C-alpha cells in the first residue's frame, strides 16, 4: 500500500496495479472435533462429503465413443449456492444414522 501510494500517486507511471488477485472473503468452517466424534462422525466422512459436494469429485473413467473421459460427481446447483447449504449437508455416523 505504501509503495502503490507513492507510485500510483507518482505521475511517472500511467498505471501500477497488483498483477494478481486481491484478497477475498473466506468462510472458515469451525468443526468441533469432539462433538463430531461423540456423535460417531469420522473426520474422513466430513472431508469426503465436503469435497464431493462442493469441490467436485472425479470418481473414475468412462468410455465416450472410444475415449476415456472422467466421471465427475458434484452437488446440484440449487443445493450449493448459499452458505446455509453447507450446514444443510448430512454425514453418516458409526450406527448408520445421518447427522446434519
Amino acid at each position: 500500500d505504501e509503495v502503490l501510494g507513492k507510485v500510483n500517486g507518482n505521475p511517472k507511471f500511467l498505471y501500477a496495479m497488483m498483477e494478481g488477485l486481491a484478497e477475498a472473503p473466506q468462510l472458515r468452517l469451525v468443526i468441533d472435533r469432539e462433538q463430531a466424534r461423540t456423535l460417531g462422525v469420522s473426520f474422513e466422512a466430513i472431508s469426503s462429503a465436503l469435497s464431493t459436494a462442493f469441490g467436485s469429485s472425479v470418481i473414475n473413467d468412462f468410455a465416450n465413443a472410444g475415449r476415456q473421459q472422467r466421471v465427475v460427481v458434484q452437488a446440484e446447483q440449487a443445493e450449493r449456492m448459499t452458505p446455509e447449504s453447507v450446514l444443510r449437508l448430512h454425514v453418516p455416523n458409526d450406527s448408520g444414522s445421518l447427522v446434519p
Binding site: 464431493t52 470418481i59 468412462f62 465416450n64 472422467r70 458434484q74 452437488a75 446440484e76 443445493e79 445421518l98
Partner: protein, 49 residues
C-alpha cells in the same frame, strides 16, 4: 448453442490433427472436453439414508 457438444467435436476431430502438425509446440484449449456429470441432490441422499 451447446458449447459442450461443439467443444467435444473440436477435441475429437480438430485438436488432435492440429497437435500432430509439425511446428506446433502447445495447444492451450480455452474450453473443456466432455465428461460424465453427476449432479447429486444431497437432500434426496439424506432421505434415502
Amino acid at each position: 448453442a451447446n458449447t459442450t457438444a461443439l467443444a467435444d467435436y473440436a477435441v475429437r476431430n480438430v485438436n488432435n490433427e492440429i497437435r500432430r502438425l509439425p511446428g506446433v509446440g502447445k495447444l492451450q484449449f480455452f474450453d473443456s472436453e466432455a465428461a460424465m456429470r453427476v449432479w447429486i441432490d444431497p437432500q434426496k441422499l439424506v432421505g434415502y439414508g
